[PDB]
Amino acid sequence: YFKIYSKHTPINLVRDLPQGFSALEPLVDLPIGINITRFQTLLALHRS
Amino acid sequence: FQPTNGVGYQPYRVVVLSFELLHAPATVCGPKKSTNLVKNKCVNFNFNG
Structure with a gap:
């Protein structure tokens, strides 16, 4: 089984991953x- | 193939279905039969396995 999990998130940070x-x-x-x-x-x- | 030939010489279309089981997940399954939903009674339910 190939599981694809996904999430769309609205961010406004310029460079790195946001913390949350x-x-x-x-x-x-x-x-x-x-x-x-x-x-x-x-x-x-x-x-x- | 002529239309006036005998039944042993008439054309027959043959479809052979071959069923195999491999270690991959089986995806060609038979129909999942369903029955009407009954509420407010103590029944044996089978929902998606």
Whole structure:
């Protein structure tokens, strides 16, 4: 089972993580049944 | 395949369903049958397992 928990928080701090409490709600459970040992973030470029 | 052929020569569409169980979580499940909800009585409830 792949559990994805998530939380959206409105912050106004410029640089670091804000200090506070926010419990993450469960968003989606995925029936994947596969081995996962590595991950990578996906970003977006800006072209002009 | 001609329409006037015998039943042993007429075309037959065949679909074979193969059921396997693997160590991955089983997700093709049969219908979850439900019955009407009855309130205010001592009943045996089965809610989502």
